[PDB]
Amino acid sequence: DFSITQFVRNLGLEHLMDIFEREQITLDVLVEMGHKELKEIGINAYGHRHKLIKGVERLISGQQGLNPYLTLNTSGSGTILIDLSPDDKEFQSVEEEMQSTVREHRDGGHAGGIFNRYNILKIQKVCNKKLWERYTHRRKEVSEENHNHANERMLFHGSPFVNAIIHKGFDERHAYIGGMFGAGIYFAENSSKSNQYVYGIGGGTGCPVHKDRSCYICHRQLLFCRVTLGKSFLQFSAMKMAHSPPGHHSVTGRPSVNGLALAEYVIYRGEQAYPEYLITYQIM
Amino acid sequence: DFSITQFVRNLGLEHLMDIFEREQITLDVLVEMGHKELKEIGINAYGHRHKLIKGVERLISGQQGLNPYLTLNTSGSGTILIDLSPDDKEFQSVEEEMQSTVREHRDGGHAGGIFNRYNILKIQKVCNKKLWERYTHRRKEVSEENHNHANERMLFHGSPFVNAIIHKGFDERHAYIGGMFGAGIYFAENSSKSNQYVYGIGGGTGCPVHKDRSCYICHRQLLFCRVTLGKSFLQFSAMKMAHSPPGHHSVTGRPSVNGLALAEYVIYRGEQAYPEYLITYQIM
Amino acid sequence: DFSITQFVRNLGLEHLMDIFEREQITLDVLVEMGHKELKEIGINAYGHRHKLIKGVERLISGQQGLNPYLTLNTSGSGTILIDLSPDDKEFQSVEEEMQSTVREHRDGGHAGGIFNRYNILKIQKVCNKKLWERYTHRRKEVSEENHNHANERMLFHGSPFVNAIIHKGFDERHAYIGGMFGAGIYFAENSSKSNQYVYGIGGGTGCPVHKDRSCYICHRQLLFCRVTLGKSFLQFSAMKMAHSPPGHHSVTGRPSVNGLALAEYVIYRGEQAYPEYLITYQIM
Amino acid sequence: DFSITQFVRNLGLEHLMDIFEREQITLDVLVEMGHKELKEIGINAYGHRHKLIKGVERLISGQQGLNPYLTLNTSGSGTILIDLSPDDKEFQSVEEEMQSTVREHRDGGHAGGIFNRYNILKIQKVCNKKLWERYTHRRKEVSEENHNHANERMLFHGSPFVNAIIHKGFDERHAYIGGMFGAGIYFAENSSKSNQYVYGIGGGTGCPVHKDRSCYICHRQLLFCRVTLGKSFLQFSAMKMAHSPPGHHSVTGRPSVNGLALAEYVIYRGEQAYPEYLITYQIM
Amino acid sequence: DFSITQFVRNLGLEHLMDIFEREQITLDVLVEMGHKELKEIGINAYGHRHKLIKGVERLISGQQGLNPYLTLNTSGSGTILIDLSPDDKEFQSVEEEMQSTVREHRDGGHAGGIFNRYNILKIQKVCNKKLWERYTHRRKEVSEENHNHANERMLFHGSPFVNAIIHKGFDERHAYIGGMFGAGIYFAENSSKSNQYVYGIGGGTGCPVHKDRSCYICHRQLLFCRVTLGKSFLQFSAMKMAHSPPGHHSVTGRPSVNGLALAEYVIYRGEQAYPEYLITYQIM
Amino acid sequence: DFSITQFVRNLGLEHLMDIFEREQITLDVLVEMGHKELKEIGINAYGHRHKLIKGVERLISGQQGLNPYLTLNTSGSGTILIDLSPDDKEFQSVEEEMQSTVREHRDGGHAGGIFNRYNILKIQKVCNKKLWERYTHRRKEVSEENHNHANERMLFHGSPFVNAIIHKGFDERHAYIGGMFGAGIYFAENSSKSNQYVYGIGGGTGCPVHKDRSCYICHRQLLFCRVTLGKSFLQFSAMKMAHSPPGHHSVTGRPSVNGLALAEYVIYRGEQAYPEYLITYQIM
Ligand SMILES: COc1cc(-c2ccccc2)ncc1C(=O)Nc1ccc2c(=O)nc(-c3ccc(C(C)(C)O)cc3)[nH]c2c1
Ligand SMILES: COc1cc(-c2ccccc2)ncc1C(=O)Nc1ccc2c(=O)nc(-c3ccc(C(C)(C)O)cc3)[nH]c2c1
Ligand SMILES: COc1cc(-c2ccccc2)ncc1C(=O)Nc1ccc2c(=O)nc(-c3ccc(C(C)(C)O)cc3)[nH]c2c1
Ligand SMILES: COc1cc(-c2ccccc2)ncc1C(=O)Nc1ccc2c(=O)nc(-c3ccc(C(C)(C)O)cc3)[nH]c2c1
Ligand SMILES: COc1cc(-c2ccccc2)ncc1C(=O)Nc1ccc2c(=O)nc(-c3ccc(C(C)(C)O)cc3)[nH]c2c1
Ligand SMILES: COc1cc(-c2ccccc2)ncc1C(=O)Nc1ccc2c(=O)nc(-c3ccc(C(C)(C)O)cc3)[nH]c2c1
Ligand SMILES: [Zn+2]
Ligand SMILES: [Zn+2]
Ligand SMILES: [Zn+2]
Ligand SMILES: [Zn+2]
Ligand SMILES: [Zn+2]
Ligand SMILES: [Zn+2]
Secondary structure, eight states: OOHHHHHHHHTTOGGGHHHHHHTTOOHHHHTTOOHHHHHHHTOOOHHHHHHHHHHHHHHHTTTGGGOHHHHHTTTTOSOEEEEOOTTSHHHHHHHHHHHTTOOOOSSSSTTTOSOSOEEEEEEEEEEOHHHHHHHHHHHHHHHHHTTTOOOEEEEEEOOTTHHHHHHHOOOGGGOBTTOTTBSBEEEESSHHHHHTTTTSGGGTTOOTTTOOTTOSSSOEEEEEEEEEOSSEEEEOSOOOBSSOOTTOSEEEEOOOSSSSOOOEEEESOGGGEEEEEEEEEEEO | OHHHHHHHHHHTOGGGHHHHHHTTOOHHHHTTOOHHHHHHHTOOOHHHHHHHHHHHHHHHTTTGGGOHHHHHTTTTOSOEEEEOOTTSHHHHHHHHHHHHTOOOOSSSSSSSOSOSOEEEEEEEEEEOHHHHHHHHHHHHHHHHHTTTOOOEEEEEEOOTTHHHHHHHOOOGGGOBTTOTTBSBEEEESSHHHHHTTTTSGGGTTOOTTTOOTTOSSSOEEEEEEEEEOSSEEEEOSOOOBSSOOTTOSEEEEOSSSSSSOOOEEEESOGGGEEEEEEEEEEEO | OOHHHHHHHHTTOGGGHHHHHHTTOOHHHHTTOOHHHHHHHTOOOHHHHHHHHHHHHHHHTTTGGGOHHHHHOOTTOSOEEEEOOTTSHHHHHHHHHHHHTOOOOSSSSSSSOSOSOEEEEEEEEEEOHHHHHHHHHHHHHHHHHTTTOOOEEEEEEOOTTHHHHHHHOOOGGGOEEEETTEEEEEEESSHHHHHTTTTSGGGTTOOTTTOOTTOSSSOEEEEEEEEEOSSEEEEOSOOOBSSOOTTOSEEEEOSOSSSSOOOEEEESOGGGEEEEEEEEEEEO | OHHHHHHHHHTTOGGGHHHHHHTTOOHHHHTTOOHHHHHHTTOOOHHHHHHHHHHHHHHHTTTGGGOHHHHHOOTTOSOEEEEOOTTSHHHHHHHHHHHHTOOOOSSSSSSSOSOSOEEEEEEEEEEOHHHHHHHHHHHHHHHHHTTTOOOEEEEEEOOTTHHHHHHHOOOGGGOBTTOTTBSBEEEESSHHHHHTTSSSGGGTTOOTTTOOTTOSSSOEEEEEEEEEOSSEEEEOSOOOBSSOOTTOSEEEEOSSSSSSOOOEEEESOGGGEEEEEEEEEEEO | OHHHHHHHHHTTOGGGHHHHHHTTOOHHHHTTOOHHHHHHTTOOOHHHHHHHHHHHHHHHTTTGGGOHHHHHTOTTOSOEEEEOOTTSHHHHHHHHHHHHTOOOOSSSSTTTOSOSOEEEEEEEEEEOHHHHHHHHHHHHHHHHTTTTOOOEEEEEEOOTTHHHHHHHOOOGGGOBTTSTTBSBEEEESSHHHHHTTTTSGGGTTOOTTTOOTTOSSSOEEEEEEEEEOSSEEEEOSOOOBSSOOTTOSEEEEOSSSSSSOOOEEEESOGGGEEEEEEEEEEEO | OHHHHHHHHHTTOGGGHHHHHHTTOOHHHHTTOOHHHHHHHTOOOHHHHHHHHHHHHHHHTTTGGGOHHHHHTOTTOSOEEEEOOTTSHHHHHHHHHHHHTOOOOSSSSTTTOSOSOEEEEEEEEEEOHHHHHHHHHHHHHHHHTTTTOOOEEEEEEOOTTHHHHHHHOOOGGGOEEEETTEEEEEEESSHHHHHTTTTSGGGTTOOTTTOOTTOSSSOEEEEEEEEEOSSEEEEOSOOOBSSOOTTOSEEEEOSSSSSSOOOEEEESSGGGEEEEEEEEEEEO
């Protein structure tokens, strides 16, 4: 609330401050205004506008190494959630993909509970510009390294730290270090497989209110995520690795020899996934 | 050059014709020129430029029902093949995809021949704006209908009508009538599976010069294509169908239950594929 | 105010003055206007614009040895402080670096006070174009002399003359003449070490209001500065020098052979530091 | 040269082919030519130039999803080695840094050999635009995460795959799996420490000719690399980790708690290093 | 000449190497050649010139952070000495300044010897572009701080390290630590005063051949140098200072209250002096 | 011949020294040679010529403030005397002007001797480029101050220091301090009036050999000079002045109010005269 005042005073234009006070113009807003906008708010003299624009250019480009623009353009960042209408076709498609991918697991529903279908309470689209740009830059890199094909899938992820993921993104520094394929981020085609991990490895201690892994009351959260696979190394046996195999961008495992079990995937770089949808649900 | 001659004479500006003759300005060029370009070629009077621009607007927009613009923009349409360099990363990626997917088939090299490796002679990128736009429009549709996921893949296709495909695109009216899944366009993850169909169904009669289905001299052509699958229906048994199952956009099957065999896919709409790469090769 | 009037009168264009009065055109603004801008403000005749531009050229380049351009462009110079938002990641990074580098000192908090952590009230980015350009010119010089590596760090600085530094820059003519390594400017990796000098050498006489070196009420200020080290000379014992050792660009010392104590640095040229961040804080 | 032939024929401009043949204009050259350049080579009619430029626009931008520009822009990529002048100050700086950091090791020169000085045969600057762009993009990211500070250093790296590194960059998929700090890329401030790894871990089996780990004849190669550390976690005990600690961008450790030993660093992402200098040398 | 070979091979223009071999075109020469120069040496096709120029741009600007241009542009740097003709007025002026400023000293010729006149053997102009540019940059900087006045003087300097100065420039890291005004660089208006230091402090031990401080046979060397004083602080008593007083750019003292003794000056920054003339002489 | 040796060595082109030694190329010659001349002397490779020309540019223009060109370009300066042919009309015109302006004086030939005629032994043209350019620059100035009219005359000057004048030019620092019009340089329309000063004021003591003011044996010398008068002030009485009257460029007086006596002129700036002809003669 004072950087604008100093900037204007350094140019000898303090007589304009009243205008800038009535229009609630701050330095971050000012640096994005040209002749037309300044004319609109009431800066009628050409000389004053010329001085303001030159000062802004000297601040933003003259001292780029200090990155003042990043310091000014923090507002508006962050994540928001947009609720999908139940009657919408997108909501129906996500719900169908969630429900039709339930399957029996070798454990008798110990990790995630016993159930045959879900009860979806709401689905939210996660919007974060910085995370999305990170994901798209990595996706373009992988495409260029894989004959112009990103090999992008839509997979499931279960975690007790869903909030941290949606607000900060996927991070290989928080990988499943004890995973069967090494220290990476794991995604499942089957909804129930990811649901198993919602409360922690092996289901953790269940819901925080009743400590029941098969709780039918507490709300649960899953992530339906856009995952870039690139050239995916197909692995049949257990093998612990820290990064991707040379020349590859992810790992694909099919633990079930036959049946209805779908594939599982591992990525060793957090920027290769984006949490597009946050699903809130119960089991039945 | 008579179209522009009539257009200019109608406006009463025939005295400018000499300029248009020296600059090789055809009506298709003229309909895209504004004040800046007309000033560039030497139409210095504002009145003449105004008359020309008003006439172009009267013709193009004023009679949009006749679509004169479409009849003027036939120049430049068509396919171009851009050769990839063998030393480039794209060429190496595509060649590795071709080589690593070879496998044995139930027939003892009857349709495709006997071989373990290819000799890649050249790979070309297929560029066609109209076909690409048709494919992109269909892909956007499918994504909108499949929770913002096109489910795009890169798959091989073999056919004796490669030239027709690269100049006209994929057509469901030229579908495989006798296919095990019905009348549709078929793609394979294994390069050898598509190589089986290079000369026709079941290998046809082999190359046109030797009539040999395992000729190691004659050049063969395969397509590595961008295929939009959307929501695919999983098929385990032969079923003759004309279109995709309700609610789905393609069909995926696996004739080989287990082994090195990869999946096969069928689309019942030609616009859902694009022939990105054309590979010329020999079998060894 | 009368400079532009004299300039315009000397050209015989006094009849234009009314325009320049309405648009608040001063000579400093006018020396930066070409044909486009003069046309924008209403100088329609080409001859008038030509005369004005030639007159500006004659003043600025014709008498370059008098440097009128500098005499005209003093406006807009000076320092502005851009306030970081606490919710921003840059603010969090700076606060974490400040808080995580506190440590015990040989004196029982005599110079700085008894505390284990701070209370940050605000952090500001210091923006001064002339000082930044001086710093970057020197940094490029040192890089050219050190195999293209500036060896640049971020280090803490405490001083009772913080305002003079942020407005005028670092100046070796105001060096710490009595320092253990000679007459230079001293920086610390540990924030508490720099805090020891906030009120003067050895803590001075404490806060101005209560004269307490361990005051928990008065606001304190620190600088987190960008320091170019280049080829740094490692010193193990006290040695008073006036300048850097031959062939080097700074001095680094480690008074404590072990423990959490971090390194300390000395530069002998004021242009090798830039005070990027100004931190206002209390101790607890 | 058939790509440009097809492109020109599609536009109905085959009569220009003669010019394009004499000036050695390929499609990759053509897509970069405007009105000025086309006029330079003798395309004098405005309409022909307009058609060519519109066709280039319809290819490069109309089919952006196919990425034809990347297909055409593979020429000029790759690495060049620029020899430094032994009389130049850059060569002398690099050699002084290499020589002044030799020291003794716990093993009596078992891995790197027995010597106290090098014989520098040549030093080369490694130039690769794509790798440099990848490095600078990552450096910008890290700086934005670390209060505008990359924390960049110059460190030595020894490896038997130096050619692969200088032609393809640093790859964490080729990390030191059995390292003391886990699967990462390791750098040393002491040149002798990195020299210990020139022929392999623990010196391997020595030079390829004499099988001697202390050969004084065979030429060795070291890399002097630009390494971005960002926020570096300080490690005192061996821990096998796959990625950086949460919130940090690298790891720094000192196996020798005292003496003449300098620090060692580990990065868990290959894009955070760039091989700036290639040094060819002999031990003495 | 392998750098240009790699550069040309990466562009696919190796067939041009013959030309580059006959014209002795190295990469440093090539990065300075446009269309005109390339046409001069016989690159007649426009496409080849276009590729070469684009490659040079991608190197020099695309990888600016690596500074390839400075690596390529070390040739021709360094000092040259131009002999003045004894018949020209420049030589006569320098000699008159040398001769007319001799005087008696407090010690009876103990340090510099006993003489009234010199025998001037030769006078040379010292030319070094890098050092001159450093000097002029500092001179501009000082003038801007001293109301557009550098306060430049011509002063004598005597030192046993004249060669190091003329090849590397004046350096405050090699200051006169024990001088009466502190650690700086000292200059005199009297040539005899500087002659007292040609062999070291207090004359050292005289000529290297006779060990005679008053040798009339062995050749001596003085520097007549451009010195920027800016705002000079007037000192009347000995005072040991490391840098200039605040607000000043040099110090001036007059040890003799009155008489034939002229002033003496001290600068504390090496870039404020330039060694314009090198005088070789004998005392008589 | 070592300046060119250093210059060529710094460029790494010492293998060309042989050529430069055979063609007697010195640095002053080299700084004036382009591609054409270097090709003429046998520098056949374009790269070598390019390097030489760039080095010359970096010396002459890069270090202009040192003025290396003036140091290199002293050769050829100085005066030459061109004898006039006694049969040519220029000699005859000068002799006629000399003879026709003799007259009687208030003293009976006391200062210049007794005679009616001269014996002209020779007349020479004085050629000095530096002095001529000084004269023409001043003439341009005076014309611009006097409505485009220099007011240039041809006048006689007698002086015992003719040699100094013809080698160094006219100098108002060597003015006739005791003259009737003040401290200026005096010229006469009568040749006998100037002859009165050939041996000094009032004739001095006479010729150096016979000490005779009317010697008929010894050779005398007069100057016939181009004098710029500009706006001349008419002075009727003796009045000592140091400079011209305000607004004027010279003074004209007529001591004899009537008869065969012509006018006399005084300039107060040495650069307003040029000594065009040197006349050697005897009085008869
Ligand atoms: C490639 O996947 C596998 C392959 C094999 C195999 C074995 C032998 C042969 C062939 C294959 N066995 C097991 C897995 C597997 O574990 N897959 C999944 C699937 C979903 C999630 C999931 O939704 N979430 C977390 C999660 C998330 C966070 C965390 C914490 C928060 C603890 O970091 C831990 C696990 N892990 C998964 C892991
Ligand atoms: C879904 O795919 C199958 C499934 C089963 C199955 C059977 C039982 C149970 C479960 C599954 N059996 C066979 C196939 C199969 O034939 N797949 C392919 C794979 C590649 C190509 C190919 O590259 N090209 C043409 C082609 C191209 C052009 C033409 C025309 C009609 C143009 O000649 C005909 C066939 N067909 C393929 C067909
Ligand atoms: C290289 O640094 C040292 C080395 C050794 C040593 C001793 C033995 C062996 C090996 C090493 N001992 C002490 C220091 C030291 O004094 N370090 C610092 C660290 C921070 C600041 C700081 O933030 N501020 C001012 C400041 C600033 C301004 C002024 C005034 C305004 C008085 O000019 C005075 C001191 N000095 C520092 C000084
Ligand atoms: C962080 O560094 C260490 C810390 C500790 C420690 C232990 C306990 C406490 C505190 C600290 N112990 C050992 C190291 C260490 O190994 N340092 C280095 C230093 C240089 C190179 C080097 O130049 N090159 C390769 C290389 C390069 C390539 C390869 C491959 C796998 C490609 O062959 C393997 C190793 N490794 C280094 C490794
Ligand atoms: C400001 O100058 C003085 C002032 C007073 C004074 C004392 C009291 C009151 C008022 C004034 N007393 C002495 C000096 C003085 O020492 N003047 C000079 C004059 C010329 C040279 C010179 O040509 N060269 C080196 C040189 C050069 C190189 C070296 C090294 C260290 C490189 O050997 C040492 C001395 N010193 C000078 C020193
Ligand atoms: C404007 O001239 C006069 C005006 C009046 C006057 C008095 C009252 C009223 C109105 C007018 N009276 C005398 C003179 C006069 O002295 N005229 C000349 C004419 C020629 C030469 C000449 O050729 N040479 C040297 C010369 C040259 C060199 C030197 C030095 C000083 C170098 O020895 C001295 C005199 N003086 C002249 C002097
Ligand atoms: Zn519960
Ligand atoms: Zn055949
Ligand atoms: Zn207080
Ligand atoms: Zn060997
Ligand atoms: Zn001697
Ligand atoms: Zn005589």
